[PDB]
Design a protein around this ligand. Structure first.
Ligand code: CLA
Ligand code: CLA
Ligand code: CLA
Ligand code: CLA
Ligand code: CLA
Ligand code: CLA
Ligand code: CLA
Ligand SMILES: CC1=C(/C=C/C(C)=C/C=C/C(C)=C/C=C/C=C(C)/C=C/C=C(C)/C=C/C2=C(C)CCCC2(C)C)C(C)(C)CCC1
Ligand SMILES: CC1=C(/C=C/C(C)=C/C=C/C(C)=C/C=C/C=C(C)/C=C/C=C(C)/C=C/C2=C(C)CCCC2(C)C)C(C)(C)CCC1
Ligand SMILES: CC1=C(/C=C/C(C)=C/C=C/C(C)=C/C=C/C=C(C)/C=C/C=C(C)/C=C/C2=C(C)CCCC2(C)C)C(C)(C)CCC1
Ligand SMILES: CC1=C(/C=C/C(C)=C/C=C/C(C)=C/C=C/C=C(C)/C=C/C=C(C)/C=C/C2=C(C)CCCC2(C)C)C(C)(C)CCC1
Ligand code: SF4
Ligand code: SF4
Ligand SMILES: [Ca+2]
Ligand SMILES: [Ca+2]
Lengths: 38, 144, 740, 31, 80, 98, 144
């Protein structure tokens, strides 16, 4: 995986952020929202 | 009620399971989580070492098993921690004599223990496999 | 009770996992929520529409940004016939190194996807030429989306919250949307084509720097006021014009040519400018029809009340009386409006598909075969989903909003009274078409299999060939109007204003475009299969809507809602009796219908593009030819996207092809196996967790239950539909882009 | 030619203002 | 819970009370029919929604109707 | 608060779960003239005693299905069964026959 | 009293700050300190990596950021620990219902958590930067 487009280091960071960190954070926050009592 | 079986009426099974660190009487919750974490992070390095993507990668044949076990211990810690936050009540809002893993501070003590044991058990297994040629010289006496 | 869902106290007290599922599924049914007043309903819908608009503008902005950042738009405009467009770059760390080289294509040294949406052909025709052009377009849609996001937040603030009467003022909404949203936007688009797109089509760079100083015409607006507007219809772009340069370029800005530009095989840009100016005038004046507080105009209510007989036929009479109270039937019911606005949008979405392939509006779109295949199938499947949802919300209106007291013996009351005549007549047309279309196909199959292909029944479609001859096609030799050179319709006798006619008959007799293709006996049978699919899907949807309030099996069906499982095994058994269940059955028939539509469009075009139109003409009359010469034959390069000898760029479509077969089949589990099997299975799993040491320390918050009866019909239909779409989309793109 | 590294970074900064405004509309539609 | 409604067309045949596996229904003296009894639904919070009562009702249309409402642990038939 | 003999039964996997301890419970008492064999509503055969019997079950439907078996499957019939809803605090509410 | 502002009357601000590990209800103090420590030791490696004295030192370009973050976590732990020793009273010499961070054992539990999270967050950031060429091959698929 490499790119010659401008700032090709951005998919290096953003694809782990969008597909690992963001879903784990959103599923974590949605777990708190749908399982909180009262 | 329940069944009377030669597994349920087995005294070795009840003494083994009852003295696993989840159940062993008199343990603090931080120590329960620590012993559970050290066992679990240690074996979790192994699978990606032998059959993973970095098994034929000469610069770092062991890095894939370490970061796999770290991220599994991360999601295991966060899932265990989020579980106690939604399921349990603190020690103030419970009765006395309330079985500390059934309180939220005791469960989160166990969660902190699982993280610390899990990552460091994973780093321990990674460290021995990374230094395996020097462990092998120790175990064979090539260091004299 | 729990927090989620906030809007339903009946669901928030549910102790099982059904609460989570139903809270997701009823979140946008705003009328069912607790304490929903009518104008809090309209205000939440209004702000929701601001959010949906901003999602569209961010979606377009991401298309422009990724083409500008990672595409090859500048290299593509130099040679749009052999450069493939780039959608975006690939970043997949799980790729092997021979997949990096297989996807490093379209003249790029990084892995890319070949775009098939047609955004290159669209942005090139409307005047964009550089990545800096698309980048400023991308930045502009991002601030526009931020404007609409702020506008939705602002119109929920208590001062700016609109009243209920502002939401029901239909005359002020139609005047502002006909004149402003339709007319001024079409007028401003004619302004874009004349000032920007037509100069950029003639080698002339026009941007924000120098568009105040380059006139669109050399005689600029001095002949517009004097009324001699024919000087704007000059020498057009000639038959030797090269698109994007001043070679062969005319100077006219508003022509009336017809046909296609001979290099691009696309519509003339000066016809599309004169189209958008002409309908802007028809829409701006139509926005000055209904009365507002300026004093005259029309009340929509009094027009419909006076249109009872009407009649110049009479026909007094039998129909109906009708049209009394249909203003407030329309205006009080949001589900009547949504069902009506989807039925109009669904006809228009399918009109987009049938016209963009035969009258291509974008330069070199008619030679990008995979893009043309993808665009037709996209807009026909979307039109099929929109059309079924028009009937779904028509049935929700009949349960929730329909008033038989107000609508008393009007046109809408009257269609329900002879509802057994409409359903039984739809049932006969469906049975007549299906018995005779399938019977003709099976008869031809037996003739070809027995070795006698001249005994098969080949009915020529003589009515639609006559329409092609009536529009100017000389291949069948009928010689009626517009193919008769001396007919009344071709000469256009008292005015002779037939300027389009020479361009039209040039394009309709060229045997190289998709404009009124030659049709034969294989085209006869598949139109009657399509008519079968249109009538059966209507039959399920109409009978679901007309029996939604009750039938003889369940007379009080409106008391139970739009969606409910059944009424129990009594009275013979009542599985799938609700009106939601007839939505559910009709999605199957819709997908089968659009399946037969897009199979036929693709095979006829794939036969034309391969230079063998006789393969369609010989094999489409029996069903083994469809299986062998269309499905089996064109699967070859797709399923070799990866093999034990390696992989190529079709490996993503091969993998998606198998994924689509898997999702489709997973849906069969939810559709065939039903609930009580799974609830008793989950009961043993609940037992095993509670009795397992070290795992019974972990307790669920919600009790695990099987999915509900309605939910797994929906989940099974969703897997069926998703597996239907991505299987064909993988096959359509890989069978067309492998040889083209 | 495609974008420069400054043009990509400007778009990421410009993307923050529909990101903040969608978050404001999200919590306003919820209540 | 579910809603069980008994209508004025009940003939007091008590077959819906015999058919109920959760003992939701009982007969109340009514003098509005020849039998003098009508079905009633006091313990609707124990109703599972099986509609065995509607299967047993011999009037056309049914004198007893079950409306599936908000789900509880009792109405979902859960032993856990 | 309720007397009666537990039926002779080796136990099973179909009986009470965590709900019986924390949410609600059910008991059915009946008096029998014979030491006979009946089918458990949770599966399996048990031995009822002469005199008062007492059986704890998870749901009300399981108790009423046993009472239907006590009526229709024995000679003579056993009508005198009583069903109680037991709460975790110990409050025992007599629910059938109401 | 205080000001009524659109920051103070913001429900997202109060739910974000109130659920940071210093304030999140039901956490044990060892877990509060652990989450705070892991976040703080992790970022503290970064500055000396990029602009420090060992940024152009080829034998160990990352060692300077690690020992900087370790010594800052040491002085942070010792300062936090000495703070609780002079400021708070133990759980015995306080009333019931006394907010465990306001007791000396709860503060020193949080201090022990901050040390363990801080050093190990620092070692985690050091370990990823030291193996960055192998992390980059993982993230680009040069391991296939
Ligand atoms: C909204 C349409 C849209 C779509 C479908 C995509 C899709 C993609 N982007 Mg792109 N992105 C977009 C808009 C979009 N982008 C815009 C407008 C910008 C300029 C700020 C970017 C800037 C950008 C960068 C710098 C990179 C990507 C990358 C990618 C790819 C990987 C996912 C990712 O890491 O995104 C990252 C996402 C962002 C940086 C922010 C996205 C901002 C959009 C507008 C948010 C859209 C939210 C959406 C409307 C919500 C809809 C509702 C939901 C329920 C569906 C993926 C093909 C990566 C890539 O190209 O790999 C090869 C990558 O490195 N995008
Ligand atoms: C402008 C268009 C429009 C609008 C505003 C609405 C609005 C509405 N519809 Mg209607 N409808 C529409 C078009 C529209 N619809 C179309 C096109 C169809 C045909 C599909 C329907 C058929 C329909 C039915 C049968 C029903 C509604 C209902 C509703 C109401 C509630 C929706 C809800 O809360 O569920 C939220 C929706 C979901 C939770 C479903 C999301 C999942 C779906 C199945 C897509 C899954 C795709 C998947 C994510 C893709 C990933 C693939 C990948 C993994 C490989 C709401 C008023 C309901 C109603 O009014 O009840 C009385 C109702 O029963 N609609
Ligand atoms: C799920 C819904 C869906 C999706 C994802 C698509 C996707 C697509 N459509 Mg399709 N379409 C759909 C449903 C959909 N369609 C429906 C329901 C209709 C019937 C209305 C159409 C009718 C349609 C047509 C006629 C065309 C497309 C085209 C396209 C393609 C181009 C991308 C695009 O549209 O940019 C996003 C576009 C916009 C955001 C347009 C904004 C401009 C609006 C109309 C006017 C703006 C006026 C301005 C603000 C006023 C200023 C006035 C002032 C100056 C005075 C893309 C493949 C085009 C194509 O085939 O390209 C090859 C094309 O020509 N679509
Ligand atoms: C509705 C959108 C729209 C807008 C905002 C404009 C705006 C403009 N036009 Mg254009 N134009 C439009 C539609 C539009 N036009 C249409 C529909 C036609 C076809 C009749 C034209 C044909 C036209 C000509 C021939 C000329 C303009 C010119 C102009 C410019 C000066 C107008 C003036 O001063 O009086 C101004 C930028 C004049 C100019 O000097 O542009 C630089 C000019 O000579 N327009
Ligand atoms: C084609 C059908 C049609 C018919 C039968 C009418 C009939 C009428 N119009 Mg309408 N109108 C129409 C279409 C039509 N209009 C269209 C297409 C527009 C947009 C250009 C208008 C815009 C319009 C306005 C602005 C006004 C009328 C008015 C009128 C009324 C007065 C004319 C008369 O001679 O008495 C008459 C009832 C006048 C009126 O007061 O209506 C009651 C009036 O002020 N019309
Ligand atoms: C290929 C599979 C298939 C076929 C052939 C059919 C056929 C039919 N569907 Mg069905 N449907 C299907 C799949 C299919 N469906 C699926 C998967 C669903 C989703 C569950 C539906 C949901 C559905 C609905 C909701 C409705 C239909 C209706 C119909 C009938 C439409 C009227 C017609 O065209 O008459 C032509 C008849 C045929 C094409 C079938 C006859 C086949 C030949 C001629 C039989 C020859 C006799 C044979 C040799 C003797 C047997 C030999 C020996 C064992 C005795 C037709 C019988 C509609 C209906 O029944 O309205 C009247 C209707 O409302 N279908
Ligand atoms: C439903 C559509 C359909 C239609 C319109 C036809 C029509 C025909 N078939 Mg076909 N066929 C069909 C379905 C259909 N078939 C199917 C589904 C199969 C598979 C089972 C076949 C298998 C088949 C075979 C194997 C043959 C035909 C043949 C024929 C031809 C027979 C002409 C005739 O008079 O015989 C019908 C007989 C009569 C009408 C005799 C009438 C006797 C009564 C007593 C008189 C009544 C009126 C006084 C006729 C064109 C024959 C042929 O030569 O093809 C060109 C032939 O050999 N068919
Ligand atoms: C003890 C222990 C343990 C355990 C732990 C646990 C306890 C865990 C948990 C876990 C968890 C606790 C998890 C969770 C998860 C979650 C999820 C997975 C989520 C998801 C979500 C979603 C998916 C969402 C959805 C949605 C909604 C809701 C709304 C709308 C939107 C959407 C659709 C998105 C372990 C193993 C470590 C080890 C040893 C020790
Ligand atoms: C500062 C800075 C920067 C930046 C950074 C960042 C931070 C960025 C990023 C950015 C981003 C990261 C962005 C994001 C975006 C997003 C968006 C824009 C979103 C949207 C959304 C939406 C639109 C939503 C929707 C919805 C839904 C889904 C549901 C509900 C409703 C609504 C509608 C709301 C740089 C480095 C460049 C440069 C230097 C400085
Ligand atoms: C060819 C041609 C022509 C003709 C045209 C025509 C005449 C057309 C028409 C058209 C048509 C004829 C269309 C139609 C459509 C329809 C539809 C699409 C329907 C739908 C429906 C719905 C969906 C409904 C619903 C509902 C219900 C069911 C119930 C109640 C409510 C509601 C009403 C909503 C002309 C002369 C121009 C010339 C050129 C050529
Ligand atoms: C929570 C936390 C924290 C905090 C901590 C703290 C709380 C700290 C403290 C600190 C401290 C607590 C410090 C201390 C210091 C001290 C000093 C600095 C001292 C000095 C001294 C001197 C200087 C002396 C003087 C003198 C005298 C007095 C006498 C005479 C002689 C002389 C002059 C020598 C941190 C940030 C980690 C992080 C996050 C968490
Ligand atoms: S409701 Fe039906 S079954 Fe019950 S008593 Fe009345 S008629 Fe008989
Ligand atoms: S639905 Fe079932 S449980 Fe409810 S009253 Fe009828 S028979 Fe009894
Ligand atoms: Ca490898
Ligand atoms: Ca140095």
């Amino acid at each position: 995986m490499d790119g010659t487009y401008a700032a090709s280091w951005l998919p290096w960071l953003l694809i782990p952020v969008v597909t690992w960190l963001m879903p784990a954070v959103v599923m974590g926050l949605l777990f708190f929202y749908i399982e909180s009592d009262a | 009620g329940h069944l009377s079986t030669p597994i349920s009426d087995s005294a070795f099974v009840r003494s083994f399971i009852g003295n696993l660190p989840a159940y062993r009487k008199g343990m603090a919750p931080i120590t329960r989580g620590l012993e559970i974490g050290l066992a679990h992070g240690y074996f979790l390095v192994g699978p990606e070492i032998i059959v993973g993507a970095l098994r034929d990668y000469a610069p770092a044949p062991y890095l894939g098993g370490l970061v796999t076990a770290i991220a599994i211990v991360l999601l295991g810690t966060t899932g265990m921690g989020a579980h106690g936050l939604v399921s349990l009540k603190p020690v103030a809002e419970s009765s006395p004599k309330t079985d500390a893993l059934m309180t939220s501070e005791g469960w989160s003590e166990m969660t902190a223990g699982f993280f610390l044991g899990g990552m460091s058990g994973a780093f321990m297994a990674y460290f021995l496999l990374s230094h395996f040629s020097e462990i092998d010289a120790i175990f064979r006496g090539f260091v004299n | 009770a729990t927090k989620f869902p906030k809007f339903s106290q009946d669901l928030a007290s549910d102790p099982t996992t059904r609460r989570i599922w139903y809270g997701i599924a009823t979140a946008h049914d705003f009328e069912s929520h607790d304490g929903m007043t009518e104008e809090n309903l309209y205000q939440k819908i209004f702000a929701s529409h601001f959010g949906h608009l901003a999602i569209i503008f961010l979606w377009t902005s991401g298309n422009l940004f990724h083409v500008a950042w990672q595409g090859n738009f500048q290299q593509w405009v130099k040679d749009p016939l052999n450069i493939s467009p780039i959608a975006h770059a690939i970043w997949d760390p799980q790729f092997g190194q021979s997949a990096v080289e297989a996807f490093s294509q379209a003249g790029a040294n990084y892995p890319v996807d070949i775009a098939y949406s047609g955004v290159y052909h669209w942005w090139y025709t409307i005047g964009m030429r550089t990545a800096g052009d698309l980048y400023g377009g991308a930045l502009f849609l991002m601030i526009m989306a931020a404007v609409f996001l702020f506008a939705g937040w602002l119109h929920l603030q208590p001062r700016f919250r609109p009243s209920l009467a502002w939401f029901k003022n239909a005359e002020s909404r139609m005047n502002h949307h006909l004149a402003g949203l339709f007319g001024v936007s079409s007028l401003a688009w004619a302004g874009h084509l004349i000032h920007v797109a037509i100069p950029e089509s003639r080698g002339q760079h026009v941007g924000w720097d120098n568009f105040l100083f380059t006139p669109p015409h050399p005689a600029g607006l001095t002949p517009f006021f004097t009324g001699n507007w024919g000087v704007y219809a000059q020498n057009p772009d000639t038959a030797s014009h090269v698109f994007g340069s001043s070679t062969g370029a005319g100077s006219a800005i508003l022509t009336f040519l017809g046909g296609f530009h001979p290099q691009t095989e696309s519509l003339w840009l000066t016809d599309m400018a004169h189209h958008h100016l002409a309908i802007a005038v028809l829409f701006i004046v139509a926005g000055h029809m209904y009365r507002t507080n300026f004093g005259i105009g029309h009340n929509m209510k009094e027009i419909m009340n006076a249109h009872n007989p009407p009649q110049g036929t009479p026909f007094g009479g039998m129909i109906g009386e009708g049209h009394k109270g249909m203003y407030d039937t329309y205006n009080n019911s949001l589900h009547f409006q949504l069902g009506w606005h989807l039925a109009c949008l669904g006809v228009i979405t399918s009109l987009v598909a049938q016209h963009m392939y035969s009258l291509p509006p974008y330069a070199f779109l008619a030679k990008s075969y995979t893009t043309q295949a993808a665009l037709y199938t996209h807009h026909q499947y979307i039109a099929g989903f929109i059309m079924v949802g028009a009937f779904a919300h028509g049935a929700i209106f009949l349960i929730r909003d329909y008033d038989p007291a107000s609508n008393s013996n009007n046109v809408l009351d009257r269609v329900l009274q002879h509802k057994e005549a409409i359903i039984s007549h739809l049932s006969w047309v469906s049975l007549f078409l299906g018995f005779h279309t399938l019977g003709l196909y099976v008869h031809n199959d037996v003739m070809v299999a027995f070795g006698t292909p001249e005994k098969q029944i080949l009915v020529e479609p003589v009515f639609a060939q006559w329409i092609q001859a009536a529009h100017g096609k000389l291949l069948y030799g009928f010689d009626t109007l517009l193919s008769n050179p001396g007919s009344i319709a071709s000469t256009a006798w008292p005015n002779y204003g037939n300027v389009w006619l020479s361009g039209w008959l040039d394009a309709i007799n060229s045997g190289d475009n998709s404009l009124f293709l030659t049709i034969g006996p294989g085209d006869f049978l598949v139109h009657h299969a399509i008519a079968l699919g249109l009538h059966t899907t209507t039959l399920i949807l109409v009978k679901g809507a007309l029996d939604a309030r009750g039938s003889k099996l369940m007379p009080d069906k409106k008391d139970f809602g739009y969606s409910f499982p059944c009424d129990g095994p009594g009275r013979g058994g009542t599985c799938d009796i609700s009106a939601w269940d007839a939505f559910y059955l009709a999605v199957f028939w819709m997908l089968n219908t659009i399946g037969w539509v897009t199979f036929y469009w693709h095979w006829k075009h794939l036969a034309i593009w391969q230079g063998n139109v006789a393969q369609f003409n010989e094999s489409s009359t029996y069903l083994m030819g469809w299986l062998r010469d269309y499905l089996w034959l064109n699967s070859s390069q797709l399923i070799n996207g990866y093999n034990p000898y390696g992989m190529n760029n079709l490996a993503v479509w091969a993998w998606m092809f198998l994924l689509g077969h898997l999702v489709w089949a997973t849906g069969f589990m939810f559709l065939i196996s039903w609930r009580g099997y799974w609830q008793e299975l989950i009961e043993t799993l609940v037992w095993a967790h509670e009795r397992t040491p070290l795992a019974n320390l972990v307790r669920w918050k919600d009790k695990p239950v099987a999915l509900s009866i309605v939910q797994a019909r929906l989940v099974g239909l969703a897997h069926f539909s998703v597996g239907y779409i991505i299987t064909y989309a993988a096959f359509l793109i890989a069978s067309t882009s492998s040889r083209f | 030619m495609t974008l420069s590294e400054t043009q990509v970074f400007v778009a990421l900064v410009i993307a923050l203002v529909p990101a903040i405004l969608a978050f404001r509309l999200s919590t306003e539609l919820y209540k | 819970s579910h809603s069980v409604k008994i209508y004025d067309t009940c003939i007091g045949c008590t077959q819906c009370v015999r058919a109920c596996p959760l003992d939701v229904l009982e007969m109340v003296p009514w003098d509005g029919c020849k039998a003098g009894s009508i079905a009633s639904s006091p313990r609707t919070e124990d109703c599972v929604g099986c509609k065995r009562c509607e299967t047993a009702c011999p009037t056309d249309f049914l004198s007893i109707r079950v409306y599936l409402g908000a789900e509880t642990t009792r109405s979902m038939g859960l032993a856990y | 608060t309720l007397t009666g003999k537990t039926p002779v039964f080796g136990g099973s996997t179909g009986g009470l779960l965590t709900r019986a301890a924390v949410e609600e419970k059910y008991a059915i008492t009946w008096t029998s003239t014979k030491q006979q064999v009946f089918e458990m509503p949770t599966g399996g055969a048990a031995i009822m005693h002469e005199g008062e019997n007492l059986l704890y079950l998870a749901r009300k439907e399981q108790c009423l299905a046993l009472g239907t078996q006590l009526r229709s499957k024995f000679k003579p019939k056993i009508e005198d069964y009583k069903i109680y809803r037991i709460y975790p605090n110990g409050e025992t509410q007599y629910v059938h026959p109401a």
